[PDB]
Design a protein around this nucleic acid. Structure first.
Lengths: 257, 120, 204
RNA sequence: GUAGAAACUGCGAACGGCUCAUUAAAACAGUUAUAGUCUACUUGACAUUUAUAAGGAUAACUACGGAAAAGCUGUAGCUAAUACUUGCAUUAUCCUUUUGGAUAAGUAUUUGUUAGAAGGAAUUAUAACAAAGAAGUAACACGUAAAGUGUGUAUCAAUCGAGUUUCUGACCUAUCAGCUUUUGAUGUUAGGGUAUUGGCCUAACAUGGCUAUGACGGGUAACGGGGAAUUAGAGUUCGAUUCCGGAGAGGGAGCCUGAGAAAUAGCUACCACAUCUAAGGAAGGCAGCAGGCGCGUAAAUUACCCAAUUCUAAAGAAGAGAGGUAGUGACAAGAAAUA
């Protein structure tokens, strides 16, 4: 037969997972769920390769058995669970709170965050659709369906969801002053103010983004996540602050020590 | 029999109630030191009233002697040791004894005893 | 040859091994489900009547009902067919079976008594065996006891002491889960009213 | 209470592993479309035309058997289940205007008549009227804060995928120049079929379609690509083989279950081989791991283990010749004694 494949070879795994060639033949195929396998990491490599809490898959299972870890403040016990582009992880035994972000090299890193910070989730709406009775639902990058969204919300907006109740708090638009984070390209992880939105009829609409240092980079509109307005980002960013530095002069900061 | 226990990359893991780290065994010009001595030393350095709550593994003596790298795991208690350690590591530490090593002949017997071919 | 006479009402049976073909000649040319007077099998069998229910031919292949031949045939076997134990779900196999019509080929034969004879047979109509285990459903227990909805029946157990457990009870856990799912319906309805309502004010 | 042989039920066995015979615009690659579709597990939303809890019938089991033999099974008697099958409030809208009366009640899907958040473009979402109408909305199980979980379920969405699909890209050969078209070839119309579009198939109709920019053929000791060797630069040659895609399970064909198979350690038949047989009949598929014969210039152990990697499960605890570990190993590769 030719049903769905259920194995993932290590060298076939996504590169940002950082699975060593010599450390086994297979990679943990993430279970289906909120995020795509390509743009998410499983909990096995979240608690085994990044936090180094576990030394093995069985240890990851031992962690998950005790209902300690929560993803979007609800208990998750699946080892191959997609974490996602941006979302909160709570380790209750060790009290600590993470948000999955991209570093400027496009790799998923758990950003330490505070308990008060760990109630806001930025969800990028992807589809707005009205069902029976003219009720409007927004399907977000996370994969949730939020009904009775505000009519002002558009397709590429972002919403600040309250984790415990799943309700929108405020929405952010996509003006040329709105700061965004890039999601999958060469410039994955950068944060910038949107230079402009070059819209072309029938193909990918391109958007140009200004870094903090006035460096312009363009990207496909699908690879953009509005993170704040022109004042400040609505989330704490990882230590790089979403600024990508030229390889030639990153060496200068590496050498100075 | 004196040495130096250089503990590196130490972190606390309440999730397994353990403490991860790696060891450097500075024992210049003298043979590799047995594991009981380093167990005793680690208990002394971390104020532990016992010795059986810790597991040492992955010991390599490096080239030219006088050094050894390994990994250690403290545990909150022996109950945590038994809960979070595999059978082979418990047998290494001597906490239990090795289970019967009949091995892969059970795989033969399992399907030799096709169900309802054996009334039992 | 080894005729197996059953007694369902007494829940007990007996086997007679005979070699005279003239004795069982009346049995011949009788399909499954035929009634037949077991008079020539034995003297103490006079007055009994036997219903033909099954058999095995000389090589042991069973007799199936629908096949109306005197010999062996091969045919596909489905999931619901009577003479097949499937290997896996949906697995159909072709097997050789013996026809329902009986002839001088039956290495075994299976009948049951339908109307009583004029004699007693040791171990056939002299003793009996019950269900060997009591009903497990509370409806069946209530049918047996006619106690209706008066009191519990876990003090009405059949033991070998040791008692079986009763299905479809009235346990307070069952009542509590029922009422909790009701309350779930109610609270979900209420919160749906409120979150449909609050939509309207921000709609302006 | 603790467990629990067996068995029924559930899920998986459609993944993995192997091989490269087939295959020359096919497969594959990059690039699109699916506004022409299906999609289990998982995730998020969330539902409509006796009730202090409904029905029979079966396995396991018990007794009696048949056969040389097989993962064969006959009869009789019992019993459950989240197996199989029946079946128990309510909400929304109009108004004098917290509050009172009044009005109305089918999820998908199909047909007819209409109105019309987004997309690039709608016969879109949705809404109204008129007809049909599946399947369901818990007669099920265990227990966390100093109410929870499991299992099952209608639809939408997401996800893991799949099938089709656009454009472009291949070796040698003209001592292969005209091919295709009754037998579907090219297209129109109508329908059937499909999960969906489509000559995919059928009926009628028209005579189209491809070709020296190489059609149609023939050859390939041809699976395609990522890649390999040799490269100053151009090139030439190789790629069975770690990964991806395809195809196959001796050769063909057919089919059940299932979300998913034209599955092959599933079934049915023929062809070729081939095993047991008491001669009546049974059972087979190493291009899985070892291993044997044969073939050949040409290729290892009938080993140990689930410790790692990861998958399946009723999901810590069991399995896994996947995989890892060692054995054989002057295939290659690196360091480096014989002072």
């Amino acid at each position: 037969g030719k049903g769905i494949k259920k194995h993932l070879k290590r060298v076939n795994a996504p590169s940002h997972w950082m699975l060593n060639k010599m450390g086994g033949q297979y990679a943990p195929k993430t279970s289906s769920g909120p995020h795509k396998l390509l743009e998410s990491i499983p909990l096995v490599i979240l608690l085994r390769n990044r936090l180094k809490y576990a030394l093995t898959f069985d240890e990851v299972k031992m962690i998950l058995i005790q209902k300690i870890v929560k993803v979007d403040n609800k208990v998750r016990t699946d080892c191959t669970f997609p974490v996602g582009l941006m979302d909160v992880i709570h380790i209750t035994k060790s009290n600590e709170y993470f948000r999955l972000l991209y570093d400027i090299k496009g790799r998923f890193v758990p950003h330490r965050i505070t308990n008060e910070e760990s109630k806001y989730k930025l969800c990028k709406v992807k589809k707005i659709l009205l069902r029976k009775g003219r009720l409007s639902i927004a399907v977000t990058h996370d994969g949730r369906s939020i009904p009775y969204i505000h009519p002002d919300v558009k397709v590429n907006d972002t919403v600040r969801l309250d984790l415990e109740t799943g309700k929108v708090l405020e929405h952010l638009k996509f003006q040329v002053g709105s700061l965004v984070m890039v999601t999958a390209g060469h410039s994955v992880g950068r944060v910038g103010v949107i230079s402009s939105i070059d819209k072309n009829m029938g193909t990918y609409d391109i958007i140009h983004v200004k870094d903090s240092r006035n460096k312009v980079f363009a990207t496909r509109l699908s690879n953009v996540f509005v993170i704040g307005d022109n004042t400040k980002p609505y989330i704490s960013l990882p230590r790089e602050k979403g600024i990508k530095l030229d390889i030639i002069e990153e060496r200068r900061n590496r050498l100075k020590a | 029999d004196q040495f130096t226990i250089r503990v590196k990359k130490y972190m606390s893991n309440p999730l397994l109630r353990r403490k991860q780290f790696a060891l450097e065994i500075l024992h210049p010009n003298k043979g590799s030191v047995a594991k009981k001595e380093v167990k005793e030393r680690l208990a002394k350095m971390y104020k532990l009233n016992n010795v059986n709550t810790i597991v040492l593994f992955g010991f390599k003596t490096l080239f030219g002697g006088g050094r050894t790298k390994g990994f250690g795991l403290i545990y909150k208690n022996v109950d945590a040791v038994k809960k979070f350690e595999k059978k082979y590591r418990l047998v290494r530490e001597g906490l239990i004894d090795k289970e019967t090593k009949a091995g892969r002949r059970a795989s033969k017997e399992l399907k030799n005893r096709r169900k309802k071919v054996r009334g039992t | 040859m080894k005729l197996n006479i059953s007694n369902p009402l007494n829940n007990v049976q007996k086997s007679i091994e005979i070699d005279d073909e003239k004795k069982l000649l009346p049995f011949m040319e009788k399909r499954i489900g035929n009634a037949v007077p077991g008079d020539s099998i034995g003297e103490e069998f006079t007055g009994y009547v036997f219903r033909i229910t099954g058999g095995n031919d000389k090589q042991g292949f069973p007799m199936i009902q629908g096949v109306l031949t005197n010999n062996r045939v091969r045919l596909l076997f489905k999931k619901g067919m009577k003479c097949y134990r499937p290997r896996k779900k949906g697995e159909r196999k072709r097997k050789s079976v013996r026809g329902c019509i009986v002839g001088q080929d039956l290495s075994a034969l299976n009948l049951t008594l339908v109307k009583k004879g004029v004699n007693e047979i040791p171990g056939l109509t002299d003793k009996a065996v019950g269900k060997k285990l009591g009903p497990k459903r509370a409806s069946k227990i209530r049918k047996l006891f006619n106690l209706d909805k008066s009191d519990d029946v876990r003090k009405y157990v059949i033991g070998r002491f040791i008692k079986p457990k009763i299905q479809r009870l009235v346990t307070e856990k069952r009542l509590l889960r029922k009422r909790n799912l009701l309350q779930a319906k109610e609270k979900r309805r209420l919160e749906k009213k409120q979150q449909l309502k609050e939509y309207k004010q921000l709609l302006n």
